[PDB]
């Protein structure tokens, strides 16, 4: 809908931090809205942006697109200002027809959810261990 | 969503001191102009204290003004009033408001507590 | 934020007069926040305009964009409804960079509504004097 | 007016500091004048100028201009005098044309005072959030 | 000498007419200094500027030069504010060289403004009556 | 600052005579600002020049030139006019990085004026005998 | 004359700063006579120079040249010994003919000094301020 | 600095005669039209005389207008008052006054002597 101020509850290895995120406009060539932390120093911010298909009449395939990007901050010593050593990216494409209804986008979205929550994934990725 | 839940509460004697806090989730804390609306027993609303965005310019009424005291803590997202001399009409409800985008507050959100 | 109505108090040289502005959307093809008077004819309206850009591969700086705009309107000799006479304009654009911290950025708007309120600026605008 | 000294109250996000500003004098070639933080060196000073213009053959209407800059200073190891990081940049325009009336122009003056200390314009200009 | 408010009496063809200029600054670029009346919009002000010039590389001469601008102004049919209609002007040059004693020049001033106020420049100015 | 009419005492030979200086302008071509003396006949009068460069925000040497000139008057048998036998020139410049405080400047200014009250330089100047 | 230590007293923004200068000889090459301050590592001493020219029979114009130039220093980190940052120089030239006397010369330099000391030129050098 | 001294001061008897003197730095003397105002030992301020830029134009009131006369020197820039027959009434301090850029003078620069 509207983009309004997202707060995220229970997140991390613990499940104890927020995120809280304000709307940062839509972008006009493309249609991708923003979202973004508010933290000083806008170089070192918790970023996501959502991008969803326009629908027109005659088009095929609906596209949905997730970005996440969290970088970290080094105080360099021998500067004043904290640069980027890292980032840590998320890129997730949802892909549908135009025959396809609703349950069937929820079924697919929750399923992603609960397998994020799964032990297979919090040990893929939080340890970086191949299933095998 | 704008969120308020204040703390403090309390039952106290005649002459004490108290701290009533507020939590203020929900929206960006520091741009806003916050305020303390108290519910008398009776069922009478009286404005409390208004302070501005950075905590500079506070305004009290006259039967407030030398003994209740308001401040910000905006990196806390906390709103504090502290009372003090207590004298028996002090026996209310205590709610936070978050004031309109304007010059003079007219009471937009307001906070269940205490 | 979020637009709501603003009411601007101690307006004028006396300092006694009061101007509400009610909201009126977003622009999503530029971005601009619009506000507005609460009259039937839109040319009478007094307005603001209020928009910010992020960086791109063009600028790399975050711009601020104030703009306000009040019409005058008399009705002439032989007209029945009034007619726009005159526009007063202003136009603020405040520029930074993504290595500014909060506090410069308000240290920098307080300045500008700070110098706004100074003997040599209201005899700047008001008499239409040069500082000599 | 006079190029006097300006002294800033109640500037920053806390509101409690100042500003002092001392005149350098106006430019035979632009016309503007400019004036300059107390204590100093060149090019690590807060700057204002502000100029006004008269019509003529190109232009029928007054312009009034202001015009703050400031820098930041980062000390450097291996130097002892500080460079500049970052500059800060805010410039306004007033355009009057010549039948306008000292009430006109005062209000526009007064209303962008009184809105620049509003919750729009806060979380517009520093934290760069827009408004949704 | 130092700009302060002229005040002019025994104006017009009775002779009992008063007016005040008050000073408006010089003007860096060009060295035209500049007096106008006491009015809001500046489209109806009677002003006066004066400069003088020095010799150059050009002209080899001091060059003294003085113009008087008064509108008249009227609301037409089915108009509020007044409008300027007409435009009375006036343009004195003076010029001397680098040996002239200033008893001359005052001779010259003098004598002018002796000229200004005989039976014959006042019926060939107020009358428009060509000396004959 | 604003240019004033100066008036210098205690000066000559003997520490009596004095130099009184009216404004005559600036050139707007490059911003020199003249004082001359009250004297008829303008090609006779003791002229001094002041010349500061502009601040601009990325200018590395600040400059300040100083110039004197008085002349002699010589009424030749056989002419109505004086002429110039003899000019007297001063030439004082003093230069500044954008680093330099305001009391490494002052110590300059105040320095070079003792050393003129000096009897090596009230020596040099006024008998002239090299030093050795 | 013959060249001595040489102390000024009441020197800076204040008044009370002295500098003590001892003779340092003169160049047999152009007659530059030098005086310079006691101060340990002779790269940063205060230096001035004097230069009058040779008293010919047929020289039609005498010339006398004055020159300061006082250094800053600065312990780099990361080093022994101290450079110099900054530099400030003043450079001033007389010129005379042949048939000016010893009023003349007199009254110049003590007018030079009369201004160094006036609050136009203690305005244009201790805070760059151009006249206008 | 628009600077203004008096000398002559006096005690004198009546019937007498005194030569009030005026200096005027800090401006163009010869531009300007000067004034005589003078202040009673009763603490009241009156008007004596004005003259023009170059000596032309003299005015004085009723009071003055036969035993008082005013001059000017523009190139010693002096101010002079010759004060004659003394009728005991004129036993002020005789203020020198710079007028206004004007047609009839209000004073705004004031020198105090006398």
């Known amino acids: 809908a509207k983009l309004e101020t997202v707060t995220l509850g229970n997140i991390g290895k613990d499940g104890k931090q927020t995120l809280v995120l304000n709307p940062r406009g839509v972008n006009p060539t493309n249609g991708v809205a923003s979202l973004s932390q508010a933290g000083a120093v806008p170089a070192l911010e918790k970023r996501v942006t959502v991008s969803v298909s326009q629908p027109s009449r005659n088009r095929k395939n609906y596209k949905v697109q997730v970005k996440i990007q969290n970088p970290t901050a080094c105080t360099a010593n021998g500067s004043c200002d904290p640069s980027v050593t890292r980032q840590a990216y998320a890129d997730v494409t949802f892909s549908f027809t135009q025959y396809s209804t609703d349950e069937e986008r929820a079924f697919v979205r929750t399923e992603l959810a609960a397998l994020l929550a799964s032990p297979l994934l919090i040990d893929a990725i939080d340890q970086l261990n191949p299933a095998y | 969503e704008v969120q308020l839940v204040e703390s403090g509460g309390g039952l106290v004697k005649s002459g004490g001191s108290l701290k009533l806090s507020c939590?203020?989730?929900?929206?960006?804390?520091?741009?806003?102009?916050?305020?303390?609306v108290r519910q008398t027993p009776e069922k009478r609303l009286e404005w409390?204290?208004?302070?501005?965005?950075?905590?500079?310019?506070?305004?009290?009424?006259d039967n407030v003004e030398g003994r209740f005291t308001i401040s910000r803590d905006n990196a806390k997202n906390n709103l504090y009033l502290q009372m003090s001399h207590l004298k028996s009409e002090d026996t209310a409800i205590?709610?936070?408001?978050?004031?309109?985008?304007?010059?003079?507050?007219?009471?937009?959100?307001?906070?269940?507590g205490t | 934020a979020k637009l709501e109505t603003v009411t601007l108090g101690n307006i004028g040289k006396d300092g006694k007069q009061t101007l509400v502005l009610n909201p009126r959307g977003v622009n999503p093809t530029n971005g601009v926040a619009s506000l507005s008077q609460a009259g039937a004819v839109p040319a009478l309206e007094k307005r603001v305009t209020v928009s910010v850009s992020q960086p791109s591969r063009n600028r790399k700086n975050y711009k601020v964009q104030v703009k306000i705009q009040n019409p005058t309107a008399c009705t002439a000799n032989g007209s029945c409804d009034p007619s726009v006479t005159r526009q007063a304009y202003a136009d603020v654009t405040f520029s930074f960079t993504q290595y500014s911290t909060d506090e410069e950025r308000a240290f920098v708007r307080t300045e500008l509504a700070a110098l706004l309120a100074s003997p040599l600026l209201i005899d700047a605008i008001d008499q239409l004097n040069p500082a000599y | 007016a006079k190029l006097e000294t300006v002294t800033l109250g109640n500037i920053g996000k806390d509101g409690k500091q100042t500003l002092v500003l001392n005149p350098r004098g106006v430019n035979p070639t632009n016309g503007v004048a400019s004036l300059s933080q107390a204590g100093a060196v060149p090019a690590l000073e807060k700057r204002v100028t502000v100029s006004v213009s008269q019509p003529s053959r190109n232009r029928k209407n007054y312009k009034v201009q202001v015009k703050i800059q400031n820098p930041t200073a980062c000390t450097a190891n291996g130097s002892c005098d500080p460079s500049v990081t970052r500059q800060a940049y805010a410039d306004v325009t007033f355009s009057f044309t010549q039948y306008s009336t000292d009430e006109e122009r005062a209000f526009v003056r007064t209303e962008l005072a009184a809105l620049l200390a509003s919750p729009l314009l806060i979380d517009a200009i520093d934290q760069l959030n827009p408004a949704y | 000498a130092k700009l302060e408010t002229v005040t002019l009496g025994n104006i017009g063809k009775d002779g009992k007419q008063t007016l005040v200029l008050n000073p408006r600054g010089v003007n860096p670029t060009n060295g035209v200094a500049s007096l106008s009346q006491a009015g809001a919009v500046p489209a109806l002000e009677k002003r006066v500027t004066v400069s003088v010039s020095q010799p150059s590389r050009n002209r080899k001469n001091y060059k003294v030069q003085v113009k008087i601008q008064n509108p008249t102004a009227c609301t037409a049919n089915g108009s509020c504010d007044p409008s300027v209609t007409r435009q009375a002007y006036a343009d004195v040059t003076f010029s001397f060289t680098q040996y002239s004693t200033d008893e001359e020049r005052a001779f010259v001033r003098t004598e002018l403004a002796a000229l200004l106020a005989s039976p014959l420049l006042i019926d060939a100015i107020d009358q428009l009556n060509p000396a004959y | 600052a604003k240019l004033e009419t100066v008036t210098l005492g205690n000066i000559g030979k003997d520490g009596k005579q004095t130099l009184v200086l009216n404004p005559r302008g600036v050139n707007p071509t490059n911003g020199v600002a003249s004082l001359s003396q009250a004297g008829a006949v303008p090609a006779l009068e003791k002229r001094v020049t002041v010349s500061v460069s502009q601040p601009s925000r990325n200018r590395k040497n600040y400059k300040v030139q100083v110039k004197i000139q008085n002349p002699t008057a010589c009424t030749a048998n056989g002419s109505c006019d004086p002429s110039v036998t003899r000019q007297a020139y001063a030439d004082v410049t003093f230069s500044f990085t954008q680093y330099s405080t305001d009391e490494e400047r002052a110590f300059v200014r105040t320095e070079l004026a003792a050393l003129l009250a000096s009897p090596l330089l009230i020596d040099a100047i006024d008998q002239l005998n090299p030093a050795y | 004359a013959k060249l001595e230590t040489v102390t000024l007293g009441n020197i800076g923004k204040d008044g009370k700063q002295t500098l003590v200068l001892n003779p340092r000889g003169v160049n047999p090459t152009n007659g530059v006579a030098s005086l310079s301050q006691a101060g340990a590592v002779p790269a940063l001493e205060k230096r001035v120079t004097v230069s009058v020219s040779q008293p010919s029979r047929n020289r039609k114009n005498y010339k006398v040249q004055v020159k300061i130039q006082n250094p800053t220093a600065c312990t780099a980190n990361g080093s022994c010994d101290p450079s110099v940052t900054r530099q400030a120089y003043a450079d001033v030239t007389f010129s005379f003919t042949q048939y000016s006397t010893d009023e003349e010369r007199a009254f110049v330099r003590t007018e030079l000094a009369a201004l160094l000391a006036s609050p136009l030129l203690i305005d244009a050098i201790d805070q760059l301020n151009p006249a206008y | 600095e628009v600077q203004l001294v008096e000398s002559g001061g006096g005690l004198v008897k009546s019937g007498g005669s005194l030569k009030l003197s005026c200096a005027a730095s800090?401006?163009?003397?010869?531009?300007?039209?000067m004034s005589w105002v003078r202040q009673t030992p009763e603490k009241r301020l009156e008007w004596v005389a004005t003259?023009?830029?170059?000596?032309?134009?003299?005015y004085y009131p009723d009071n003055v207008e036969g035993r008082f006369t005013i001059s000017r020197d523009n190139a010693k820039n002096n101010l002079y008052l010759q004060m004659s027959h003394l009728k005991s009434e004129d036993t002020a301090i005789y203020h020198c006054?710079?007028?206004?850029?004007?047609?009839?003078?209000?004073?705004?620069?004031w020198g105090q002597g006398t």
């Open positions: 800090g401006f163009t003397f010869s531009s300007y039209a």
């Open positions: 006054a710079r007028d206004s850029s004007g047609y009839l003078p209000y004073f705004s620069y």
């Open positions: 003259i023009s830029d170059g000596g032309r134009y003299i």
